[PDB]
Amino acid sequence: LATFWYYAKVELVPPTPAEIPRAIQSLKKIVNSAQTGSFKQLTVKEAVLNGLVATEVLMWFYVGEIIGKRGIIGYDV
Amino acid sequence: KARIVEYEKEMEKMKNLIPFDQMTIEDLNEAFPETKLDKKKYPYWPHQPIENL
Amino acid sequence: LQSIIKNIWIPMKPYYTKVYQEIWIGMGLMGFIVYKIRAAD
Amino acid sequence: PPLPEYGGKVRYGLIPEEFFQFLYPKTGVTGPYVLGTGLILYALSKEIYVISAETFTALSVLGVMVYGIKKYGPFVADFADKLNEQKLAQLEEAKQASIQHIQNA
Amino acid sequence: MPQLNTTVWPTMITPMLLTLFLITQLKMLNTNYHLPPSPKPMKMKNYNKPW
Amino acid sequence: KKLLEVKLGELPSWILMRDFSPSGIFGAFQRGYYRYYNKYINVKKGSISGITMVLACYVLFSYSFSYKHLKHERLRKY
Amino acid sequence: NLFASFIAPTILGLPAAVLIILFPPLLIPTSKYLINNRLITTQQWLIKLTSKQMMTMHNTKGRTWSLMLVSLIIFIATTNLLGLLPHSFTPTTQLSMNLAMAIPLWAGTVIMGFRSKIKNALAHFLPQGTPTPLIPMLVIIETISLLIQPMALAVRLTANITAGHLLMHLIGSATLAMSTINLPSTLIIFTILILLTILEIAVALIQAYVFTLLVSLYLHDNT
């Protein structure tokens, strides 16, 4: 109905130009933790959570692929 | 008076039964021994006459 | 060996030794039939 | 030992609430749902789920299951509850009966 | 007919004999129906007073 | 204190500390069955979800070994 | 291609048929309690009803098979019902499993009838008031009947379950082949498929019950 949009307007929206620096800082934090190997502090609970969010953004990529080939099942040709 | 003290012991026993939803089947066969399967007269499952079921 | 034959063979002993003897003979017969079928194939 | 009074709070009969609570921190309320739809679309887009006759036999049996559950679920739940209530009532009656017998003696 | 391929016939017969003759029967043996809790309020092996 | 349950313990040595014995795997499967059973089935006022989740996992398993046959029914080629 | 659902399943090279045949009893949890959850309550009510149905017609020696016949009907009914889920492998569609179920039980009953009962066992091949000039013929008939009873058991299960599944699959294909064509006809075929699904549930239960009832009658004729 409309509750879907009630949540989507806060969650399922693109990032405003004001909060891309926050995302850059978070990406820098992640690549730093990977560099120094500090990710050995992450419990497998949080590791699974991060894996699920990465899988979700990969699914976003694949949905974008099915919307970029105009056909859902496989390649129409 | 001996018989009466025995009966009073038994009535205390019945009054102090665990509630029936925490009760196993061995506990029921201890409380009311008439509810025990005659596994000697009927050795094989269901250990009772089928009509009794 | 322990707690298996206490939970598997003590309950199933009256049936395996007394009740299902003819079932065991018939299962030997079935195995013979299946061997004759798989061998002629 | 007494049993609890409720189960594990499944949603749609397939996914427990624990998953939605576990993704609530990082991806909010729509997080699990976008993960589910993304996984479905990736499965049937890369042909991990091949559409065939089994798709329609699956839809048929799933519809029959959901209808049968929604229809005869209240009845089966009440039947089990009434069976247990009758057994409990009979047991309490038969306990009071023996109490009365020994009091009479 | 894949049902006539006699090569996979033991794979279909051996677990069944475990499931039908051991596991289902061990689960029926643990399904017991106790006899009714019928409480006799008439049980008194008494006798007349000592006279 | 390396008995930490998984979902709390970040280490690979934990992986090799577990009892990877036949009896150990049997205990693991039995503990999982009883966790599921006590959470979903062995309650009064229980729900049918404790069975439909098992049936969904069963259907997923059934599809898993049915894929070698379905991948010849794909309607695209890439 | 068409019988792909009746081929011994294998996952990563292992015989998954073993797991599929061992799974049905996992759905029957048992408890030592006196008052327990809804699943065990409903299942114990069903098992009691089934025992009273199947076993009341037997004498004290045929009633020793209560465990065997109730296990048989529960196992077959749960296997046939689990065979209705999508993509599943139904082991009762296999002639091997059904022969291994039918031959041991029928042979056990007839051997039980020939060990004791031997006078009555040999007398059963002739009806009571059979006229004289027909006594030979009715012994050639009855005899071969007693010799087809096992096969006609197994086949009757196999040939039925298999067939049912086949039909459903075919109708499924129809719907798929009609999805890109007139949609009201697709919905009519889908309604036929739903009616067939309900019929297949009924036939699962009925075939369990009939296999068990015929084994029960062969046992009753020999105790």
XYZ file of C-alpha atoms in Angstrom:
628
model
C 0.000 0.000 0.000
C 1.576 3.236 1.243
C 3.490 1.991 4.294
C 5.992 0.540 1.824
C 6.682 4.101 0.714
C 6.604 5.273 4.338
C 9.701 3.141 4.905
C 11.213 3.519 1.430
C 11.443 7.316 1.633
C 13.861 6.922 4.558
C 15.564 3.708 3.431
C 15.100 3.027 -0.299
C 16.240 6.409 -1.619
C 19.488 7.463 -3.312
C 22.132 9.238 -1.217
C 21.779 13.006 -1.111
C 24.875 14.961 -2.239
C 25.466 15.944 1.404
C 26.148 12.424 2.732
C 28.533 11.106 0.062
C 31.474 12.298 2.247
C 30.153 10.061 5.026
C 30.164 7.146 2.578
C 33.700 7.974 1.434
C 34.852 8.044 5.061
C 33.190 4.678 5.710
C 34.822 3.175 2.615
C 38.185 4.513 3.792
C 37.580 2.958 7.213
C 36.803 -0.404 5.604
C 39.824 -0.412 3.301
C 42.001 0.647 6.247
C 40.695 -2.206 8.406
C 41.401 -4.563 5.506
C 44.914 -3.137 5.091
C 45.959 -3.417 8.739
C 44.148 -6.754 9.024
C 42.102 -5.427 11.946
C 39.002 -7.283 10.707
C 40.082 -10.079 13.063
C 38.111 -8.063 15.636
C 34.807 -8.707 13.830
C 32.740 -11.506 15.343
C 31.188 -13.901 12.846
C 27.799 -12.433 13.762
C 28.869 -9.064 12.368
C 30.790 -10.794 9.577
C 27.591 -12.559 8.496
C 25.678 -9.282 8.740
C 28.217 -7.520 6.514
C 28.113 -10.436 4.089
C 24.334 -10.194 3.887
C 24.458 -6.461 3.181
C 27.098 -6.996 0.485
C 24.923 -9.727 -1.022
C 22.011 -7.281 -0.975
C 23.943 -4.624 -2.880
C 25.073 -7.276 -5.370
C 21.405 -8.161 -5.828
C 20.828 -4.463 -6.474
C 23.441 -4.715 -9.225
C 21.716 -7.736 -10.746
C 18.286 -6.084 -10.620
C 19.886 -3.165 -12.424
C 21.133 -5.686 -14.967
C 17.664 -7.120 -15.566
C 16.369 -3.560 -15.970
C 19.184 -2.872 -18.449
C 18.490 -5.835 -20.733
C 14.704 -5.188 -20.770
C 14.059 -8.867 -20.028
C 13.801 -10.696 -16.719
C 14.586 -14.304 -17.634
C 18.102 -14.633 -19.073
C 18.963 -12.640 -22.170
C 15.983 -12.154 -24.483
C 18.221 -13.009 -27.449
C -6.268 -45.595 64.217
C -3.483 -47.352 62.313
C -5.683 -47.569 59.222
C -6.637 -43.912 59.630
C -3.053 -42.697 59.826
C -2.285 -44.687 56.669
C -5.275 -43.113 54.903
C -4.159 -39.653 56.009
C -0.683 -40.288 54.609
C -2.254 -41.370 51.318
C -4.505 -38.317 51.158
C -1.509 -36.063 51.726
C 0.215 -37.927 48.887
C -2.727 -37.330 46.551
C -3.012 -33.694 47.628
C 0.682 -33.112 46.844
C 0.602 -34.347 43.247
C 2.509 -32.355 40.649
C 0.100 -30.584 38.264
C -0.915 -32.735 35.335
C 0.827 -30.660 32.661
C 4.267 -31.171 34.239
C 3.451 -34.865 34.636
C 5.101 -37.732 32.764
C 3.322 -41.042 32.188
C 5.415 -42.839 34.813
C 4.217 -40.219 37.288
C 0.615 -41.018 36.380
C 1.262 -44.743 36.732
C 2.643 -43.983 40.193
C -0.266 -41.739 41.205
C -3.161 -43.837 39.845
C -1.714 -47.346 39.383
C -4.851 -48.489 37.552
C -3.651 -46.417 34.570
C -0.711 -48.753 33.963
C -0.434 -50.835 30.815
C -0.636 -54.567 31.519
C 2.580 -55.307 29.654
C 2.414 -58.905 30.921
C -1.100 -59.813 29.789
C -0.527 -57.793 26.588
C 3.190 -57.955 25.724
C 2.913 -56.291 22.299
C 1.911 -52.781 21.293
C -0.480 -51.098 22.109
C -0.383 -53.215 25.295
C -4.179 -53.123 25.587
C -7.266 -54.308 23.698
C -7.848 -52.346 20.521
C -11.430 -51.637 21.588
C -10.094 -50.085 24.800
C -8.323 -47.399 22.755
C 27.148 -50.859 21.482
C 25.767 -49.258 24.637
C 22.627 -47.081 24.673
C 21.956 -48.208 21.103
C 20.778 -51.730 21.931
C 19.172 -50.180 25.006
C 17.088 -47.833 22.837
C 16.860 -49.943 19.644
C 17.090 -53.655 20.392
C 15.606 -54.010 23.891
C 12.332 -52.419 22.670
C 12.304 -54.241 19.321
C 13.377 -57.642 20.670
C 9.890 -59.173 21.227
C 9.049 -58.416 17.594
C 12.322 -59.320 15.894
C 12.641 -62.624 17.752
C 9.018 -63.778 18.095
C 6.517 -61.893 15.943
C 8.348 -61.236 12.667
C 9.985 -64.654 12.166
C 7.805 -65.356 9.144
C 8.529 -61.814 7.955
C 12.223 -62.690 8.123
C 11.660 -65.835 6.043
C 9.675 -63.781 3.542
C 12.409 -61.159 3.439
C 14.891 -63.882 2.585
C 12.509 -64.874 -0.205
C 12.313 -61.258 -1.397
C 16.096 -60.984 -1.389
C 16.288 -64.160 -3.456
C 13.807 -62.723 -5.966
C 15.724 -59.439 -6.164
C 18.996 -61.312 -6.689
C 17.454 -63.365 -9.498
C 16.134 -60.143 -11.046
C 19.393 -58.184 -10.842
C 21.431 -61.189 -12.001
C 19.263 -61.739 -15.087
C 19.827 -58.115 -16.077
C 8.677 -29.338 32.857
C 6.002 -27.062 31.394
C 6.028 -26.063 27.762
C 6.173 -22.421 26.666
C 3.007 -20.760 25.396
C 4.127 -19.584 21.956
C 6.568 -20.606 19.285
C 9.181 -18.604 17.455
C 7.206 -15.955 15.572
C 7.614 -17.007 11.968
C 6.505 -14.685 9.162
C 4.646 -16.061 6.124
C 5.320 -19.495 7.576
C 8.820 -19.407 6.113
C 11.123 -16.872 7.820
C 11.379 -16.218 11.580
C 11.251 -12.738 13.060
C 14.836 -13.221 14.249
C 16.055 -12.544 10.709
C 14.103 -9.301 10.383
C 15.363 -8.164 13.784
C 18.909 -9.130 12.786
C 18.799 -6.989 9.642
C 16.907 -4.144 11.343
C 20.093 -2.359 12.560
C 21.940 -2.091 9.247
C 19.191 -2.158 6.596
C 16.033 -1.099 8.424
C 12.555 -2.513 7.907
C 12.639 -2.973 4.122
C 16.111 -4.530 4.230
C 15.030 -8.167 4.439
C 12.349 -7.615 1.807
C 14.692 -6.029 -0.718
C 17.148 -8.845 -0.007
C 14.426 -11.395 -0.710
C 13.224 -9.769 -3.915
C 16.794 -9.270 -5.100
C 17.610 -12.921 -4.484
C 14.443 -14.070 -6.264
C 15.150 -11.872 -9.284
C 18.784 -12.970 -9.421
C 17.706 -16.611 -9.199
C 15.148 -16.509 -11.996
C 17.183 -14.024 -14.058
C 20.392 -16.068 -14.158
C 18.182 -19.158 -14.570
C 19.023 -20.689 -11.235
C 15.261 -21.219 -10.958
C 14.215 -22.773 -14.274
C 10.557 -22.136 -15.084
C 8.905 -25.391 -16.139
C 5.802 -27.481 -15.473
C 7.016 -27.863 -11.896
C 6.493 -24.120 -11.455
C 2.776 -24.572 -12.042
C 2.431 -27.787 -10.055
C 4.263 -25.877 -7.305
C 1.877 -22.933 -7.502
C -1.063 -25.340 -7.437
C 0.119 -27.247 -4.370
C 1.141 -24.030 -2.597
C -2.265 -22.491 -3.217
C -3.961 -25.646 -1.962
C -1.722 -25.598 1.121
C -2.299 -21.926 1.949
C -6.053 -22.256 1.444
C -6.246 -25.451 3.483
C -4.213 -23.886 6.273
C -6.211 -20.649 6.444
C -9.453 -22.665 6.308
C -8.886 -25.689 8.583
C -6.244 -24.151 10.841
C -8.575 -22.649 13.417
C -10.482 -25.936 13.498
C -7.375 -28.090 13.987
C -5.965 -25.772 16.648
C -9.259 -25.793 18.544
C -9.515 -29.575 18.168
C -6.083 -30.135 19.700
C -6.775 -27.627 22.472
C -10.112 -29.269 23.283
C -8.507 -32.716 23.340
C -5.970 -31.477 25.871
C -8.613 -29.668 27.935
C -10.809 -32.767 28.081
C -7.878 -34.916 29.183
C -6.922 -32.389 31.864
C -10.508 -32.112 33.115
C -10.885 -35.891 33.278
C -7.621 -36.174 35.203
C -8.551 -33.497 37.748
C -11.962 -35.121 38.201
C -10.384 -38.531 38.774
C -7.969 -37.066 41.320
C -10.694 -35.358 43.344
C -12.663 -38.613 43.184
C -9.959 -40.607 44.955
C -9.456 -37.825 47.494
C -13.172 -38.052 48.277
C -13.010 -41.846 48.487
C -10.273 -41.869 51.101
C -11.974 -39.072 53.040
C -15.128 -41.198 53.098
C -13.098 -44.135 54.404
C 11.181 -46.636 -17.206
C 13.748 -45.732 -14.550
C 11.858 -48.072 -12.213
C 13.210 -51.000 -14.251
C 16.876 -50.002 -13.881
C 17.783 -52.712 -11.370
C 21.137 -51.098 -10.549
C 19.682 -48.634 -8.033
C 17.342 -51.205 -6.474
C 19.345 -51.782 -3.252
C 19.642 -48.027 -2.688
C 15.830 -47.960 -2.607
C 15.359 -51.136 -0.555
C 17.969 -50.823 2.188
C 16.847 -47.515 3.782
C 13.185 -48.532 3.535
C 13.807 -51.629 5.649
C 15.415 -49.348 8.219
C 12.586 -46.818 8.071
C 9.675 -49.258 8.032
C 10.967 -51.966 10.376
C 13.144 -49.954 12.776
C 12.509 -46.205 12.946
C 8.758 -45.911 12.423
C 8.243 -48.843 14.780
C 10.498 -47.327 17.431
C 8.417 -44.169 17.126
C 5.133 -46.054 17.446
C 6.417 -47.897 20.517
C 6.910 -44.490 22.138
C 3.265 -43.641 21.330
C 1.421 -45.137 24.289
C -2.185 -44.682 25.408
C -2.481 -45.129 29.159
C -5.649 -46.749 30.568
C -8.314 -44.292 31.917
C -7.786 -42.716 35.402
C -10.955 -44.414 36.789
C -11.019 -43.748 40.565
C -13.105 -46.258 42.599
C -14.654 -44.417 45.600
C -16.003 -47.835 46.543
C -13.045 -49.674 48.053
C -13.258 -50.484 51.771
C -12.348 -53.948 53.038
C -14.046 -53.180 56.345
C -15.678 -55.390 58.961
C -18.301 -55.028 61.674
C -17.160 -53.648 65.026
C -15.628 -56.260 67.377
C -18.994 -57.884 68.087
C 36.833 -19.923 27.363
C 36.992 -21.041 23.732
C 33.641 -22.813 24.099
C 32.199 -19.558 22.694
C 29.221 -20.349 20.486
C 29.615 -19.501 16.809
C 28.010 -16.101 16.054
C 30.180 -14.872 18.952
C 33.602 -16.336 18.227
C 35.989 -14.870 15.640
C 38.780 -17.419 15.112
C 39.645 -20.335 12.793
C 41.172 -22.433 15.591
C 37.640 -22.658 16.984
C 36.782 -24.498 13.754
C 39.345 -27.159 14.648
C 38.494 -27.168 18.360
C 35.023 -28.584 17.682
C 34.418 -32.327 17.978
C 34.453 -33.353 14.316
C 33.751 -36.969 15.275
C 30.898 -39.186 14.060
C 29.451 -38.911 17.565
C 30.230 -35.195 17.412
C 28.337 -34.650 14.163
C 25.495 -36.779 15.524
C 25.343 -34.608 18.627
C 25.444 -31.476 16.477
C 22.532 -32.577 14.286
C 20.567 -33.768 17.316
C 21.164 -30.479 19.141
C 19.997 -28.571 16.075
C 16.878 -30.713 15.813
C 16.073 -30.158 19.474
C 16.721 -26.423 19.240
C 14.280 -26.181 16.328
C 11.801 -28.512 18.033
C 11.796 -26.646 21.344
C 11.584 -23.259 19.658
C 8.854 -23.985 17.126
C 7.047 -27.283 17.764
C 7.298 -28.205 21.459
C 5.155 -25.357 22.745
C 1.508 -25.285 23.660
C -0.500 -23.031 21.353
C 2.013 -23.891 18.646
C 1.746 -22.867 15.021
C 1.887 -24.621 11.656
C 4.907 -22.508 10.740
C 7.096 -25.019 12.547
C 6.123 -27.514 9.854
C 5.964 -25.281 6.787
C 9.533 -24.148 7.455
C 10.657 -27.787 7.447
C 8.702 -28.335 4.229
C 10.322 -25.266 2.660
C 13.791 -26.567 3.500
C 12.705 -29.934 2.093
C 11.549 -28.331 -1.161
C 14.845 -26.448 -1.411
C 16.742 -29.708 -0.977
C 14.503 -31.347 -3.585
C 15.201 -28.573 -6.063
C 18.937 -28.770 -5.371
C 19.266 -32.297 -6.761
C 16.662 -31.621 -9.470
C 18.804 -28.913 -11.069
C 20.924 -31.255 -13.192
C 17.672 -32.123 -14.979
C 16.151 -28.642 -15.155
C 19.255 -26.969 -16.579
C 18.359 -28.692 -19.868
C 14.963 -26.942 -19.855
C 16.352 -23.391 -19.681
C 14.680 -21.097 -22.196
C 17.756 -18.936 -22.888
C 21.342 -19.678 -23.879
C 23.382 -16.579 -22.983
C 12.945 -36.219 -20.115
C 9.437 -37.210 -18.993
C 10.372 -39.778 -16.330
C 13.095 -37.533 -14.915
C 11.248 -37.296 -11.586
C 11.410 -41.081 -11.076
C 15.185 -41.412 -11.493
C 17.213 -42.076 -8.333
C 18.207 -38.577 -7.193
C 21.844 -37.729 -6.565
C 23.264 -34.591 -4.953
C 26.990 -34.020 -5.570
C 27.276 -37.721 -6.438
C 25.656 -39.201 -3.335
C 22.400 -41.203 -3.169
C 19.962 -38.606 -1.800
C 17.257 -41.283 -2.041
C 18.537 -42.568 1.307
C 17.796 -39.248 3.003
C 14.436 -38.981 1.257
C 13.405 -42.434 2.480
C 14.649 -41.831 6.036
C 12.994 -38.408 6.356
C 9.280 -39.326 6.900
C 9.650 -40.568 10.513
C 11.344 -37.284 11.416
C 7.939 -35.588 11.136
C 6.500 -37.749 13.945
C 7.937 -36.422 17.221
C 7.149 -38.447 20.322
C 7.068 -37.429 23.967
C 6.918 -39.021 27.403
C 4.672 -36.244 28.730
C 1.010 -36.653 29.608
C -0.247 -33.377 28.119
C 1.852 -32.184 25.189
C 1.839 -29.876 22.198
C -0.649 -29.663 19.347
C 1.392 -31.655 16.832
C 1.807 -34.700 19.056
C -1.803 -34.384 20.228
C -3.210 -34.471 16.698
C -0.797 -37.201 15.638
C -1.654 -39.421 18.596
C -5.357 -38.952 17.909
C -4.752 -39.971 14.287
C -2.657 -42.992 15.276
C -5.314 -44.158 17.739
C -8.056 -43.806 15.130
C -5.929 -45.688 12.588
C -5.151 -48.512 15.014
C -8.815 -48.939 15.917
C -9.774 -48.957 12.237
C -7.164 -51.417 11.002
C -6.864 -53.752 13.962
C -10.288 -54.313 15.543
C -11.167 -57.103 13.087
C -8.288 -59.361 14.190
C -7.970 -62.023 16.850
C -5.337 -62.058 19.581
C -2.675 -63.418 17.223
C -3.382 -61.023 14.372
C -3.367 -58.143 16.845
C 0.323 -58.746 17.517
C 0.872 -57.018 14.153
C -0.602 -53.728 15.367
C 2.846 -52.142 15.444
C 3.690 -53.483 11.991
C 0.478 -52.452 10.249
C 0.268 -49.018 11.877
C 3.911 -48.399 10.984
C 3.184 -49.512 7.422
C 0.223 -47.185 6.961
C 1.958 -44.210 8.613
C 5.127 -44.699 6.556
C 3.332 -45.115 3.229
C 0.915 -42.232 3.829
C 3.660 -39.810 4.835
C 5.853 -40.849 1.900
C 2.978 -40.403 -0.551
C 2.072 -37.015 0.936
C 5.657 -35.741 0.916
C 5.829 -36.845 -2.705
C 3.352 -34.101 -3.622
C 5.630 -31.171 -2.808
C 7.362 -29.416 -5.718
C 10.322 -31.187 -7.344
C 10.233 -34.027 -4.824
C 11.301 -37.613 -5.409
C 8.632 -40.071 -4.282
C 10.095 -43.472 -3.342
C 6.691 -45.171 -3.597
C 6.859 -44.628 -7.366
C 9.629 -47.256 -7.420
C 8.808 -50.904 -8.039
C 11.806 -51.991 -5.952
C 10.667 -50.383 -2.697
C 7.083 -51.534 -3.212
C 8.152 -55.107 -3.958
C 10.330 -55.095 -0.839
C 7.314 -53.892 1.138
C 4.847 -56.342 -0.399
C 6.727 -59.650 -0.629
C 7.986 -59.856 2.997
C 4.583 -59.131 4.545
C 2.491 -61.330 2.251
C 5.053 -64.128 2.494
C 5.116 -63.805 6.270
C 1.346 -64.113 6.451
C 1.198 -67.142 4.162
C 4.085 -68.855 5.973
C 2.344 -68.141 9.277
C -0.702 -69.792 7.748
C 1.255 -72.841 6.603
C 3.135 -73.318 9.892
C 0.090 -73.462 12.131
C -3.381 -73.469 10.585
C -2.121 -75.906 7.945
C -5.404 -77.819 7.690
C -7.342 -74.566 7.346
C -4.580 -73.075 5.187
C -5.016 -75.841 2.620
C -8.807 -75.762 3.039
C -8.999 -72.028 2.270
C -8.257 -72.662 -1.416
C -11.736 -74.226 -1.697
C -14.864 -72.232 -0.767
C -17.159 -73.873 1.754
C -20.144 -75.003 -0.306
C -18.450 -75.437 -3.668
C -20.277 -78.026 -5.813
C -18.379 -81.165 -6.717
C -17.710 -81.041 -10.507
C -16.112 -77.597 -10.035
C -13.698 -78.428 -7.194
C -10.649 -78.784 -9.507
C -11.152 -75.530 -11.431
C -11.615 -73.326 -8.357
C -8.274 -74.621 -7.077
C -6.346 -73.499 -10.167
C -7.913 -70.042 -9.836
C -7.561 -69.421 -6.097
C -3.991 -70.740 -6.132
C -2.757 -68.326 -8.785
C -4.582 -65.575 -6.913
C -2.529 -66.357 -3.818
C 0.555 -66.163 -6.046
C -0.245 -62.789 -7.642
C -1.251 -61.125 -4.348
C 2.286 -59.788 -3.660
C 2.950 -58.439 -7.160
C -0.585 -57.078 -7.524
C 0.101 -55.320 -4.225
C 3.347 -53.613 -5.209
C 2.237 -52.740 -8.739
C -1.069 -51.369 -7.466
C 0.873 -48.859 -5.399
C 3.568 -48.115 -7.972
C 1.358 -47.934 -11.055
C -0.953 -45.626 -9.166
C 1.419 -43.118 -7.576
C 3.621 -42.880 -10.671
C 0.596 -42.384 -12.901
C -0.815 -39.637 -10.715
C 2.458 -37.751 -10.743
C 2.793 -38.164 -14.503
C -0.678 -36.765 -15.077
C -0.015 -33.727 -12.913
C 3.295 -33.027 -14.628
C 1.663 -33.262 -18.039
C -1.114 -30.877 -17.055
C 1.554 -28.572 -15.676
C 3.256 -28.572 -19.063
C -0.104 -27.761 -20.635
C -0.458 -24.649 -18.491
C 3.077 -23.577 -19.356
C 2.492 -24.230 -23.049
C -0.738 -22.245 -22.741
C 0.742 -19.329 -20.796
C 1.717 -17.519 -24.015
C -1.749 -18.192 -25.501
C -5.367 -17.529 -24.420
C -5.299 -16.888 -20.660
C -8.866 -18.000 -19.802
C -7.944 -21.426 -21.170
C -4.781 -21.293 -19.053
C -6.917 -20.610 -15.981
C -9.240 -23.482 -16.894
C -6.264 -25.838 -17.186
C -4.948 -24.480 -13.879
C -8.283 -25.247 -12.219
C -8.075 -28.768 -13.635
C -4.598 -28.933 -12.101
C -5.923 -27.821 -8.707
C -8.673 -30.443 -8.763
C -6.053 -33.009 -9.749
C -3.859 -31.911 -6.833
C -6.701 -32.469 -4.367
C -7.419 -35.827 -5.999
C -3.741 -36.732 -5.653
C -3.769 -35.940 -1.935
C -6.796 -38.191 -1.548
C -5.132 -40.934 -3.605
C -1.964 -40.746 -1.505
C -3.972 -41.461 1.631
C -6.225 -44.033 -0.059
C -3.291 -45.991 -1.461
C -1.571 -46.116 1.912
C -4.795 -47.371 3.475
C -5.477 -49.946 0.758
C -1.974 -51.429 0.737
C -2.215 -51.790 4.506
C -5.763 -53.170 4.377
C -4.864 -55.854 1.855
C -1.865 -56.887 3.950
C -4.226 -56.928 6.936
C -6.675 -59.205 5.111
C -3.913 -61.594 4.060
C -2.947 -61.699 7.736
C -6.559 -62.231 8.834
C -6.910 -65.179 6.453
C -3.974 -66.882 8.198
C -4.477 -66.347 11.940
